[PDB]
Design a protein around this ligand. Structure first.
Ligand SMILES: Nc1ncnc2c1ncn2[C@@H]1O[C@H](COP(=O)(O)OP(=O)(O)O)[C@@H](O)[C@H]1O
Lengths: 340, 8, 192, 192, 192
């Protein structure tokens, strides 16, 4: 029922700074579900599936795009991690666990779990080591899984029976971050440099965005990284997040309706007290976030640690209608101003 | 009951 | 002794010598006197980079007091034959033959350090034997001197008459003077 | 012989030479006489560290009785070109050229050991030949002496006239005097 | 040739040279004449052990007929700078500079073998040139002699006047006499 323009606005409401990624997932999910409604009633039969492969920095909202999508789409969603995954029978894990995880959302799905979505994290960790149960071997097992098959699944765990569930219909989104991939593509496309005199040094570590280089990424470069070309062939769609920005972090706390700044504002509305967050206080949070190399994920630690004293003393305090936060308070050398 | 899981 | 370094790659860790690591980035080092063995080693490096990629610029750092002429001309002809632009940089000193390979680099990609020094003079030689043989070796070295001046004028842009007068004796040229002389294009004072 | 060490890492165990281990931490060793081969080796080390990290300070330990001037000037220009601050430390002795690379380090990051010793004098040379050639080589070494004194004043902060009088003959400077002379910033007596 | 040994560990078997195996246990060997190359190698070993553990004692075995003074003073300042106590042992012989590094060890952790021998004399030097230059090098070596006697008294506890008289000429000291002289603490006759 939805359209790419309608879903783009909803995605924009919760995600920002990633414009190309919205159009990729919009048209992909749009055409993916179109195939489910129409099925194979048309002349064309066995409509092939189009998988999605995301590559971007850490904490760049890759998981948020899949989580926010499940809320509007309403289909079941799961967040699997490939770090634990092992090669067909070892101590760490087996691929079978992933299949049950999706069913676990509703625990009863015959013609409903086929339309679900799955997310994978840390895909680069299984890169083929060339010096294996961690490397290439793991990829070979996922080939048949993504291509579509049926796995026996005890519904609810229990009957003397097992249920069959198709997986061709089920779309997969392999999310992950490929660190060091800039050097591989730089020598191939832009320039061989970084070590020589005339060669450009990596001066623009944070001055310029590496993202632009990632836009020119191709599957051939992924082969040198360690992945199998056969594995990448199953995921023709490609999404590339560029970077995270300091001004974006200020917008992340103001433009999204679910911003953390707005949660505290609503907390005190019922209490009958006003809340404020000046622009001079948000810019400081951006510096501390980049300092810990964590992105937006390491944001609540800075906010909750600063407002621990104010929140603890707010019920005790009386005749206080407004709260003002300053940049000095974020550093910890000052106490927030209170207005009666 | 009892799981005998070992890997070489 | 040569220090060993580790190049972090996705496939795994690999150990390289300091000279081999820079070779991977299309960088060659010209150190010491120019001889038949040292010259033949640099030629193999250029050819190896040509096959890997013929469209990426090569960087040649030169720090040498010069040497044999025939050993140096093999490098010059190679740089002109191959398609990639061989960028040249002068570190420390550039003698007669070191200066000829410096100016022979691709136009616009020649640099000299702020404190580098270039020296140019005429070919040196000698012979012992009959008078008939001395005349033969004298005519040969005269052709080389004339040939080396013709090419020097071609890349430096000066006239052949000027190169003949300036190369009669040793002539030192500072880094600023080399730019004005057409020998180089600019100076790499700081990294911008 | 060079002892081998083991660097415990998450991936596994790796064996390194003592000189290569310190190179991983942005540390370079300058030992013995300064020549074209030893000087060209240190330059490759600095560039390798620049690419790995351009924002981390580099440490250069110098223990050398000096050597060729042209070989040493290639290192000085490199330290100024690259963005990272090249910290210099004097161990044992620092001759004319070793002292020039010592003071050329980043301001505020220059140290001298409590018992180290620095020595400075004028450039040495010589020539044999016709009188016309002696005049050429004499003018060249005179420019270097003037150029080396100009740069010494820039980093030490002293006046050019003072460097000329102090560099006429050999002058030894103890560790305390080097601080008073602007050559270094402090002394690393103990680890705090 | 250096024999290879196998260090049995839980992870697996590893092959080490005899000198590298002892380095893992904070043991450094000082063999032969003290020069700039041999001295600069030991300094890197001490720093490597400092990072691995700053609270474990280091053992330094010295068997050397002495050598250059400036090369030896780099080691002395390093032992005093680092926090760990550098234990010193004399094997075979300890000359003028070998004796200065021997007594410079941590107090109470200095030993001498029952048949070892220590020798001390004044600094050696020489110069050839103008009379003005001889006076400069003479004043410098005189400062070193005075400085070396001051530090010798500090660790040995004797007075500066006594060290001056005893170091005027070669003086051999047996192992028992060294204890009475404050140079060492005890003798490691047998293992108890
Ligand atoms: N545009 C955005 N607006 C609000 N929060 C964001 C945005 N982008 C990222 N985040 C934050 O990042 C976190 C998710 O990071 P994630 O995408 O899982 O990292 P990775 O890309 O390494 O998987 C969420 O907690 C979310 O609050």
């Amino acid at each position: 029922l939805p359209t790419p323009h309608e879903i783009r606005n909803h995605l924009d409401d919760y995600v920002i700074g990633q414009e190309q990624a919205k159009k990729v997932l919009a048209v992909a999910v749009y055409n993916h579900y179109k195939r489910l409604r129409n099925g194979d009633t048309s002349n064309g039969v066995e409509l092939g599936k189009s998988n999605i492969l995301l590559i971007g920095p850490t904490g760049s909202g890759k998981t948020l795009l899949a989580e926010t999508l499940a809320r509007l789409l309403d289909v079941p969603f799961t967040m699997a991690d490939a770090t634990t995954l092992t090669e067909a029978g070892y101590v760490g894990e087996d691929v079978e666990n992933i299949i049950q995880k999706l069913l676990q959302k509703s625990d009863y799905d015959v013609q409903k779990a086929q339309r679900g979505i799955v997310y994978i994290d840390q895909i680069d960790k299984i890169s083929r080591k060339s010096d294996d149960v961690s490397g290439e071997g793991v990829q070979q097992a996922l080939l048949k899984l993504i291509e579509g098959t049926v796995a026996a699944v005890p519904p609810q765990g229990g009957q003397q029976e097992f249920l069959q569930v198709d997986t061709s219909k089920i779309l997969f989104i392999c999310g992950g971050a490929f660190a060091g991939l800039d050097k591989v593509i730089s020598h191939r496309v832009e320039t061989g440099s970084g070590i020589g005199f005339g060669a450009t040094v990596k001066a623009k570590s944070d001055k310029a965005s590496e993202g632009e280089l990632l836009a020119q990424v191709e599957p051939e470069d992924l082969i040198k990284f360690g992945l199998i070309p056969e594995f990448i062939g199953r995921l023709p769609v490609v999404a590339t997040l560029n970077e995270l920005s300091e001004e974006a972090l200020i917008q992340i706390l103001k433009e999204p309706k679910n911003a953390l700044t707005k949660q505290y504002q609503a907390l005190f509305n019922l209490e009958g007290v006003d809340l404020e967050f000046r622009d001079e206080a948000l810019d400081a949070i951006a510096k501390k976030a980049m300092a810990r190399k964590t992105g937006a994920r390491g944001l609540r630690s800075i906010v909750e640690a600063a407002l621990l004293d104010t929140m603890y003393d707010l019920p005790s305090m009386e005749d206080v209608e407004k709260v003002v936060i300053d940049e000095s308070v974020i550093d910890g050398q000052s106490e927030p101003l209170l207005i009666y | 009951x009892x799981x005998x899981r070992x890997x070489x | 002794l040569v220090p060993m370094v580790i190049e972090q790659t996705s496939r795994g860790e690999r150990s390289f010598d300091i000279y081999s690591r820079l070779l991977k980035e299309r960088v060659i080092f010209l150190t010491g006197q120019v001889e038949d063995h040292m010259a033949n080693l640099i030629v193999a490096q250029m050819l190896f980079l040509e096959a890997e990629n013929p469209e990426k610029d090569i960087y040649l750092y030169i720090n040498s007091p010069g040497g044999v002429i025939t050993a140096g001309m093999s490098i010059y002809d190679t740089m002109q034959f191959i398609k990639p632009d061989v960028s040249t940089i002068c570190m420390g000193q550039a003698a007669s033959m070191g200066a000829f390979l410096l100016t022979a680099g691709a136009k616009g990609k020649r640099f000299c350090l702020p404190n580098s020094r270039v020296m140019i003079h005429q070919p040196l030689g000698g012979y012992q034997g009959q008078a008939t043989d001395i005349e033969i070796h004298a005519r040969e070295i005269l052709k080389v001197k004339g040939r080396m001046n013709e090419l020097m004028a071609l890349h430096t842009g000066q006239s052949l008459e000027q190169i003949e007068r300036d190369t009669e004796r040793d002539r030192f040229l500072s880094a600023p003077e080399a730019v004005e002389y057409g020998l180089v294009d600019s100076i790499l004072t700081h990294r911008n």
